Swiss-Prot record, chain A:
Subunit: Component of the gamma-tubulin ring complex (gTuRC) consisting of TUBGCP2, TUBGCP3, TUBGCP4, TUBGCP5 and TUBGCP6 and gamma-tubulin TUBG1 or TUBG2. TUBGCP2, TUBGCP3, TUBGCP4, TUBGCP5 and TUBGCP6 assemble in a 5:5:2:1:1 stoichiometry; each is associated with a gamma-tubulin, thereby arranging 14 gamma-tubulins in a helical manner. Gamma-tubulin at the first position is blocked by TUBGCP3 at the last position, allowing 13 protafilaments to grow into a microtubule.
Cystine residue pairs: none
Cellular localization per UniProt: Cytoplasm, Cytoskeleton, Microtubule organizing center, Centrosome
Organism per entry: Homo sapiens
Protein known as: Gamma-tubulin complex component 3
From Swiss-Prot, chain B:
Gene: TUBG1
Reported function: Tubulin is the major constituent of microtubules, protein filaments consisting of alpha- and beta-tubulin heterodimers. Gamma-tubulin is a key component of the gamma-tubulin ring complex (gTuRC) which mediates microtubule nucleation. The gTuRC regulates the minus-end nucleation of alpha-beta tubulin heterodimers that grow into microtubule protafilaments, a critical step in centrosome duplication and spindle formation.
The protein's assembly and partners: Component of the gamma-tubulin ring complex (gTuRC) consisting of TUBGCP2, TUBGCP3, TUBGCP4, TUBGCP5 and TUBGCP6 and gamma-tubulin TUBG1 or TUBG2. TUBGCP2, TUBGCP3, TUBGCP4, TUBGCP5 and TUBGCP6 assemble in a 5:5:2:1:1 stoichiometry; each is associated with a gamma-tubulin, thereby arranging 14 gamma-tubulins in a helical manner. Gamma-tubulin at the first position is blocked by TUBGCP3 at the last position, allowing 13 protafilaments to grow into a microtubule.
GTP-binding as UniProt keyword: yes
Keywords carried by this UniProt record: Cytoplasm, Cytoskeleton, Disease variant, GTP-binding, Lissencephaly, Microtubule, Nucleotide-binding, Phosphoprotein
Name the record gives this protein: Tubulin gamma-1 chain
Residues bound to GTP: 130-136
Modified residues (Phosphoserine): 119
Top-level taxonomic group: Eukaryota
Record organism: Homo sapiens
Swiss-Prot record, chain C:
Disease: Microcephaly and chorioretinopathy, autosomal recessive, 3: A disorder characterized by congenital microcephaly and chorioretinal dysplasia associated with poor vision and nystagmus. Variable ocular anomalies include microphthalmia, retinal folding, retinal detachment, optic nerve hypoplasia, absence of retinal vessels, round areas of chorioretinal atrophy, and attenuated electroretinogram. Most patients have mild developmental delay and mild learning difficulties.
Assigned protein family: Belongs to the TUBGCP family.
Organism: Homo sapiens (Human)
Gene behind the chain: TUBGCP4
Tissue occurrence: Ubiquitously expressed.
Record note on quaternary structure: Component of the gamma-tubulin ring complex (gTuRC) consisting of TUBGCP2, TUBGCP3, TUBGCP4, TUBGCP5 and TUBGCP6 and gamma-tubulin TUBG1 or TUBG2. TUBGCP2, TUBGCP3, TUBGCP4, TUBGCP5 and TUBGCP6 assemble in a 5:5:2:1:1 stoichiometry; each is associated with a gamma-tubulin, thereby arranging 14 gamma-tubulins in a helical manner. Gamma-tubulin at the first position is blocked by TUBGCP3 at the last position, allowing 13 protafilaments to grow into a microtubule.
The protein's name: Gamma-tubulin complex component 4
Residues of the full protein shown: 573 to 631 of 667
Length: 60, 417, 59, 417
């Protein structure tokens, strides 16, 4: 427990994964829901990963 | 996404100063504006990270006459809310004529701070009702805000002259300001002079004016209401997502507010907030929607079962043309404060007894309008609106507002108000 | 991209197409169709095709 | 390999600061001596010299020699040492006095162009409409392309707008601009208006700003000539450099910007975006960038630039709308040792934009109103003999109107035509 709790930050990884995959961070989600909307209006074949990874990083 | 904070007039910039001073003391920010050493709170909504590592509030000290601004400036907070966007009058007619001529000088300031955004979405006003610099100029400015930015909300923390009558045009200045509130504004959190002046004696007495005491409560009201903006949460990170549950039709845009601290458990702060004595504002009446913010070291496990118990005993009543409830915003209490552990809950709710507060000033207008009276006997009225149509137009507009608020208290408000 | 991929092969034909277009404008020189239109339009098609094959990278 | 052709009194002043700055950055004394603190490649510009008493390659042609004794008595004459110096203010007189001196000043080009191991192009340090440079530089520009048809002619022409006294200036500007359009290969433009404002922004200089403008242009212009003179092969001469900035031949004027104006944490995105900000830009509707490059110099972290473009791009801080795909580039380079106290990064702009059409519109208007008043046609004898029916000044208008039209047309998708 003493290694995993700080050499691999296991408890922060739980706390962060709740901040993101469970929407807990809130701000990241309100802003990303805005910025990402005109991309996701379009049909799914017209979406590409370089738009998406850039806009994620922009929201972060 | 960001919120601007257009504090206006002599009273509004005092309580705005107190607001930024409270936000400064609550956030990790020095009176210099520089990052404090022990400083996670969220600043981007309210502060701009200028190149000195200066967190500058998104303010505008948008005043009209000189007195208190210099004493705000020469404080230890002199360079906090201040990238120098400041600017430089007794009644609605005079104030409107001055809000007109200057407006190129000040609209540039709004546009300047608006272009300082990633996405603006709010104009928080600190508006003094019936006061001279609040009257007229504020009403002119309220119309222009929606003309120039028709997609941006105007929200008013209006401090309201509910008291015994100094100025004889006092009822009119409240009526002619109320017109704009009743159509141009998107939300109005209303604070009452007598209710706060009573609540002063209800904890620590005052006599002839000592505004600096009741202002402490006003600052806790602003800070409490913006708390869920200033920290993360799964819900209510933004002003419109907060305001949407409370105002169900666009004419019900006024909110009464309650505040408890005048060990703890949520059921006792819920019960307290609901009692009439704790409302900071003075026929059947019923709640429309209630939201309360519990800022504290509270265990979240208690919060739901507290609602259920408060439901079962029916200590609160609503109106059955639509669903409603009390709604609870559990928040972290702020560190960087002393005794950041006393649970200190606030409520805001739409309740139809506020109609009577408007109806008081309607009746005061009718007394003066059925008398012969001092209709703003200064030439800035007589050269401007000597046909007197606007106040009677305002009076039928507020009479439709009273009728709409009383129409809200029937089972058939699915039909028209 | 020199680690061996279809990306490298498609870049190789793009570079071949570039040099051949260089050679064409470097030999024809003057504003005259020396049956230059067929070769030029063939390279317009090869470039349009391999530019669209360059845009496979977003999968 | 490249040579400067500084001409008129303006050209000598920008060229005297050019060589006075060039020896400084290449570690060379006013005498051309390699200073004892000394890799590089002075080679292109710097005439490689017997003792490593390095020389420029500069042909110090001049006309009405009144001030230039005071430039030639400086210690930097030992740098411009080959004794290749040679001795009205209207465009026609300046053009024709060039013709009346031309033979020597043409031959002593070859006396240096035969010495250069591979001449590539000619750098015209020059002003639009400026006095004795007016005519003269544009006259040489008519001749260079006939006698040297392969070599490329670039003009670092500072432009006549000074926020704004010469009455023939708009006519001279039109007449020079017919040459700068029709006869140059590329033009880098500077507004005296913007440079006055920039001097008043960084410091307190506007009207005086002149010898100070020499420092600002030489800081711009040492950078524009940097990949020629130092290792790093982003494009190691004049002609790889510019092909990024011109898609269609007539549309070849380029804007200027230079990020850290008080350089004496930062990151690439700062030094590259501070460059596109039109208020930091040394230049003063709808506006496309047709193509952009930045030459950036200092301790760039090399992994940042690839990620910088995302946070430029997705916040729509640049706006590419040519008929095709062209966009924004970076040319990384060595810190240059003429800057003593330095910011750890800096950078410099060069971009084919649409908004320069505004200064062309001022130019065309300032010609047209004085042309149709017919008072500042002057009836002077040189002004009349060059064109007794003024047909050159007529034909000079239609080409710059087409530059207005082409700038108004390459801005649309139409430019298959």
């Amino acid at each position: 427990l003493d290694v995993l709790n700080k050499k691999y930050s296991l408890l922060d990884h739980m706390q962060a994964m709740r901040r993101y995959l469970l929407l807990g961070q809130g701000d990241f989600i309100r802003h990303l829901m805005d910025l990402l909307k005109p991309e996701l209006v379009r049909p799914a074949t017209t979406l590409y990963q370089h738009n998406l990874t850039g806009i994620l990083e922009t929201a972060v | 996404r960001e919120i601007i904070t257009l504090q206006l007039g002599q009273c509004g910039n005092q309580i705005g100063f107190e607001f930024w001073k409270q936000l400064c003391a609550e956030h990790g920010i020095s009176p210099e504006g520089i990052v404090e050493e022990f400083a996670t709170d969220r600043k981007d909504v309210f502060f701009y990270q200028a190149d000195d590592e200066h967190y500058i509030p998104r303010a505008v000290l948008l005043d009209l006459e000189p007195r208190v601004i210099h004493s705000i400036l020469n404080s230890p907070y002199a360079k906090l809310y201040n990238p120098e966007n400041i600017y430089l009058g007794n009644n609605w007619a005079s104030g409107f004529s001055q809000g007109e001529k200057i407006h190129e000088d000040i609209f540039d300031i709004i546009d300047r701070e608006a272009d300082g955004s990633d996405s603006l979405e709010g104009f928080v006003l600190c508006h003094s009702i019936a006061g001279g610099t609040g009257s007229g100029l504020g009403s002119y400015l309220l119309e222009r805000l929606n003309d120039r930015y028709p997609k941006k909300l105007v929200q008013t923390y209006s401090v309201f002259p509910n008291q015994d009558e100094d100025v004889v045009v006092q009822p009119y200045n409240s009526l002619l300001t109320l017109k704009r509130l009743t159509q141009n504004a998107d939300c109005v959190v209303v604070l009452d002079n007598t209710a706060l002046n009573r609540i002063a004696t209800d904890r620590l007495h005052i006599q002839n004016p000592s505004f600096s005491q009741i202002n402490q409560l006003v600052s806790t009201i602003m800070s409490a209401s913006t708390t869920t903006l200033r920290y993360p949460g799964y819900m209510n990170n933004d002003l419109i997502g907060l305001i949407a549950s409370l105002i169900p039709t666009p004419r019900l845009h006024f909110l009464m507010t309650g505040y408890t601290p005048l060990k703890t458990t949520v059921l006792d702060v819920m019960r307290r907030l609901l009692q009439p004595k704790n409302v900071m504002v003075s026929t059947n009446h019923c709640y429309i929607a209630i939201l309360n913010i519990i800022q504290g070291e509270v265990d979240p496990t208690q919060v739901h079962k507290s609602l259920q118990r408060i439901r079962e005993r029916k200590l609160a009543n609503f109106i059955p043309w639509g669903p409603a409830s009390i709604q609870v915003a559990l928040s972290r209490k702020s560190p960087y404060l002393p005794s950041a552990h006393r649970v200190s809950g606030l409520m805001m709710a739409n309740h139809t007894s506020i109609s009577s507060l408007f109806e008081r000033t309607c009746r005061q207008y009718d007394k003066l309008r059925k008398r012969e009276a001092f209709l703003e006997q200064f030439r800035k009225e007589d050269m401007f609106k000597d046909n007197f149509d606007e106040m009677d137009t305002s009076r039928e507009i507020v009479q439709q507002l009273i009728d709409e608020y009383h129409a809200a208290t029937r089972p058939d408000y699915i039909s028209w108000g | 991209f020199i680690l061996l991929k279809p990306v490298f092969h498609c870049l190789n034909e793009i570079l071949d197409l570039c040099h051949s277009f260089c050679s064409l404008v470097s030999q024809n020189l003057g504003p005259l169709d020396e049956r230059g239109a067929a070769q030029l339009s063939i390279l317009v098609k090869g470039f349009s095709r391999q530019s669209s094959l360059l845009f496979k990278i977003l999968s």
